[PDB]
Design an enzyme around this catalytic site. Structure first.
Site, PDB file in Angstrom:
ATOM      1  N   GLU A  96       4.282  -5.037 -38.404  1.00 63.28           N
ATOM      2  CA  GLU A  96       5.010  -3.782 -38.268  1.00 63.28           C
ATOM      3  C   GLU A  96       5.842  -3.508 -39.513  1.00 63.28           C
ATOM      4  O   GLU A  96       6.666  -4.333 -39.918  1.00 63.28           O
ATOM      5  CB  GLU A  96       5.912  -3.831 -37.034  1.00 63.28           C
ATOM      6  N   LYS A 121       6.060   5.197 -32.501  1.00 61.78           N
ATOM      7  CA  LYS A 121       6.646   4.141 -31.678  1.00 61.78           C
ATOM      8  C   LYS A 121       7.161   4.747 -30.376  1.00 61.78           C
ATOM      9  O   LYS A 121       8.127   5.517 -30.377  1.00 61.78           O
ATOM     10  CB  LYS A 121       7.761   3.427 -32.435  1.00 61.78           C
ATOM     11  N   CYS A 167       5.982  -2.923 -31.720  1.00 60.26           N
ATOM     12  CA  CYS A 167       6.662  -4.147 -31.308  1.00 60.26           C
ATOM     13  C   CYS A 167       7.188  -4.106 -29.877  1.00 60.26           C
ATOM     14  O   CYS A 167       6.776  -4.908 -29.033  1.00 60.26           O
ATOM     15  CB  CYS A 167       7.812  -4.440 -32.275  1.00 60.26           C
TER      16      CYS A 167
END
EC number: 3.5.1.6
Lengths: 360, 359, 360, 358
Positions: A117, A194, A231
């Site tokens: 990431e 995200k 993540c």
């Protein structure tokens, strides 16, 4: 746990062969055959200070459908320069470091590759400082990193998944943690944002961007459909379920999570997603430790990164995790034919009463 | 595999202490303190041929809410008699074997106990024979096993979760895989049916009953809310999510799954459910091997049962699995206060966009 | 700027009377008449260590509609106990301190009262610690603070606006920065949540709750419609516009913002909202400094709070700000009749082309 | 009227520590005074106009160099009485503006602005079509436009000249339009008046209608600049729409009278700058206008408090100019800080456009 190496290496190092095999069959599922990689490539892996691991997932032969063998690469690398460095120098050093590993992977048949990431910049959301840590952000569709990645896409005909920090300038110069995916022709297939932001401890990622409104895109490549899971989206099984609903076959999880509690969740959540979605899942985490001139309260360092990148399969088998200290590359010979073979046998989708669960 | 003992024992046996501790911290989460059980109880565990393990989950002290310490017991036992035995003899032998372990657990502070799926009868769904394998089924609310369990409920004031094979006679004498849960007062708090049926290989469980229409009940005990998750319901995360939505705090998973592929999924699915629901999850699997006079095609035996019962916690910590060969009992000192402390910190429910996903 | 007192006091202290009056007419709009409060009440203000200020907004007499005079009170108080104190002791001390000021206000005709943002607990979002700073949160509809406030609501027949930290337990024990408003009958008229979260510097408020989904509620009291605007919602003029669209007449702004840059925005944003919405706006900010045993990176202290609570009027007039150091209470004699008189003359709503602006 | 600027009085009376604290409370931060040539100051003394120089500081960016733009704001009275021939008044105003432009050109200014309709005295109060509508000419081709283009192409400064456009091609109708010419002297655009103040002495509705031009943003070689007319200042939606189109420096030429409007002067423009993260300039003419005839809301048109100032996205403002004497303000704008504060204070993003504009 920083000096200690990968779990597999330690287990092989200490317990005898029968016990080691039994522990392997309990933890890592089945003893899949190691991918036969070129010897000289291994020599290059020794020369360029990165570990190379090759594994092949076996599949049941289908008389009507030939296996769609897709080689998948996962690159985990540290920052070769300190965090308190000029942006251009760090970006160039990371470009060269990534390019070397890509060159080594290209001579092994890899078709899809992925990085940690925001590989272009050190993780500095902990410091809660807008400058100069937001200076690494550029336009996702037109940036130095995007063009550099497109250069590597169209020469080795490999799909590249490059997580970056998109500076959305057309809509008010706002940063977003977006992961652009380019095809083998070097033309930006998409950019997944995200969806989930971890507002925990050192992860002060909420003070830099908002939750991605892009939803759950699935990018169609000439080899197979691939998705990107950021993540914090790893923790929520609903994220993986939604990704697998849209038809995604290989779900990547580029993450930059710190050690400790998250290390325990690392071999759990991704494997469970692969088992309960019948789609190959990849797990990527950067290695090394990041140091900053300033201190942040949840210190100069940003903890330790356990790395341990691995790929899980729909048949409950996983590749052994990479080393926890040295940066490396994992080459997994995916056979997508087994993805739907296990899906049919284990009708978790069908026996999973969507009407009885999603409704309430 | 069958001969090989629990993973924890082997790891402790071979690798040195620092490496063992690191492997523990990687696999089993955190090194939780071992529960301080009475010494004589351990002696009883040695005498009665069952292993006793005690672990305590630590929790963060709350200045306003005192910790609600609940001791939880998990019993995994084999069949002491062969499958080709009279129903009454097998049921009585299993009652005595369960009662002995209950007596040992009662002197350790346990409040809730659980047994393997259909502990009263050997798993014979593989043979696909209605007789005499459906003769073990009786009325869940009024059966010899139910009354026997109520006898153990009201003398040791422990909540008992007894998975049985309910013969639903009031609605056409049909069998159901139901798990009755009785309170410490011995009054049948409820009976959760089997929502999911595994139609795979040796698991020919579809030819004996249908999917349970009971939904996802949550039973409220004086200590805490507890749910029951049947064997095949373990695989689907949606089942655990629905159980945790209704407020269930301690979700039990009595299962009788065979070894091999399922052994790999055993430490995965239950732990993931506990992590993604912030509620304590327990995993129960019977031990030993079952032999039948007849053969069944997916043989006389019914494979090997790896047992390895364990309890997972919302903070990613798990108790070490029990031995894979010998029957035993696990005593876990649950602290429900940490259940909602981690839930608040890790707002997986809130950061999980129910509107964006369930819709 | 901590020792220095309120701006009005300093200006009156130094420059002569004609220059002072001219500066008043430039800064504070018009020299509104000081409210005639009981003398003994002032004595109580001297005794209880809090400053009392009374001002009356003048309005044009309407031959058909009698003026709807509503007295409004604004309480700004410090924490009488250190932050590192038991929750119950701090809550009880704050209850007693608030009750004393309420008793003094009740003998002055006040009908609506308001407190600083989360007056029941010291602002500890900077420390980024879940314990024990989230222990102050309780159920908004049923809490010790809510019942205590309802006790003060039904004895002095005053509308009480008590900003608290709602622990939404029925939907997963999640904290929310909600401000409950109870009528003069002590029955919870509503609970406005926090629409905007300031993710800046010491304001690490994103790691404790999410943006409020309640929207923009307007609570109807027997005296007049009142709305609640949380700290960070003050900055966005769209928030005030939406509040004034639903018919809100008196918009309160309980805030706990730190000094420095925010001190400059304090006399600007609220006044502009009042001018461009033709509705009375109140501004509340806590006074004093908060100290913590632990340090946090944007230190033991949480900066200084400049307080300076004031009420703005639709006719560009504002009450002088309260003292920046000592806690106090402001009593403003609002005349809602002038609210719509200026609205008609200054048709900012009508001359404001909603079709030409909101559409794009 | 006699009383001078607020800053001068405050500096004059209260001591230095208290003065600094009051400065930090009112004017934001003590920005550094622009270092202007000494002889230019002498010229300011000679030509009877006050010169003030301030520089807005910005955070250095390692990748983007600061785009320093000097901005000038001219506030001037009418040197001749209102009851004067149109040509004489226009010529006198041209000379007066040209002198100040000459003084500004030797200070690095790139963009300049004048008060609303600087070419003619504000006579909308009298409600008389003649001869007060005789000052109006074609915006694209007028004596004032060509005169301004003469000053544009010799000192390479962007000039914002508010005028009274006599739209003759569409029926000889007057409009309050503010033409903006580039440094090459080629009419970059002409923003019309969107909002008309129908209040009291402001009888501006009986002379023109609301401008249909919308919200244009003019792109200059230095930076994007917009023009906000007098009454458009009050509505925050006008400033929001101007900042949506990308405008970086929004000017507000106004000719508003004293009293209530004086209180709104330091408020609305500053709030627009804070809530739009774009530099805003405020211009108001100085002096008093006298007419031979009387008008009911008198011979005079009240007093003009002037007090021109420039606000910044970081809540800092230049001190207001003197309220009596005409003058010129030179502000050293650093546009780099405009988007730096915009990113930190995501008022646009945290401002739920879907939840508000809908």
């Amino acid at each position: 746990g920083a000096e200690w190496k990968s779990l597999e290496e330690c287990l092989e190092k200490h317990l005898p062969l029968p016990d080691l095999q039994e522990v392997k069959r309990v933890l890592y599922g089945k003893e899949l055959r190691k991918l036969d990689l070129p010897r000289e490539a291994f020599e290059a892996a020794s020369r360029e200070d990165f570990e190379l691991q090759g594994y092949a997932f076996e599949a049941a032969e289908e008389q009507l459908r030939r296996p769609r063998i897709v080689h998948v690469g996962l690159v985990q690398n540290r920052i070769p320069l300190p965090a308190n460095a000029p942006v251009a120098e760090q970006v160039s050093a990371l470009h060269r470091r990534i390019k070397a590993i890509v060159e080594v992977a290209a001579m092994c048949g890899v078709n899809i590759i992925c990085f940690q990431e925001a590989w272009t910049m050190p993780f500095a959301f902990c410091t809660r400082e807008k400058l100069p840590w937001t200076e690494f952000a550029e336009s996702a569709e037109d940036g130095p990193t995007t063009r550099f990645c497109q250069k590597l896409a169209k020469n080795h005909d490999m799909v590249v998944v490059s997580p970056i920090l998109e500076r959305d300038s057309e809509h008010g110069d706002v940063l977003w943690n977006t992961a652009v995916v380019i095809s083998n022709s070097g033309a930006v297939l998409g950019k997944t944002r995200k969806n989930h932001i971890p507002r925990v401890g050192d992860f002060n990622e909420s003070t830099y961007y908002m939750e991605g409104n892009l939803g759950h895109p699935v990018f169609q490549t000439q080899f197979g459909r691939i998705a990107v899971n950021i993540c914090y989206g790893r923790h929520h099984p609903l994220n993986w379920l939604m990704y697998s609903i849209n038809g995604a076959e290989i779900i990547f999880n580029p993450s930059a999570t710190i050690g400790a509690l998250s290390e325990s969740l690392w071999p759990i959540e991704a494997r469970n997603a692969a088992i309960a979605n019948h789609c190959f899942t990849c797990a990527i985490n950067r290695v090394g430790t990041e140091h900053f001139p300033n201190e942040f309260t949840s210190h100069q360092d940003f903890g330790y990164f356990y790395g341990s990148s691995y790929v899980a399969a729909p048949d409950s088998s996983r590749t052994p995790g990479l080393s926890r200290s040295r940066d490396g590359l994992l080459v997994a010979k995916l056979d997508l034919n087994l993805c739907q073979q296990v899906n049919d046998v284990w009708n978790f989708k069908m026996t999973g009463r969507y009407e009885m669960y999603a409704r309430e």
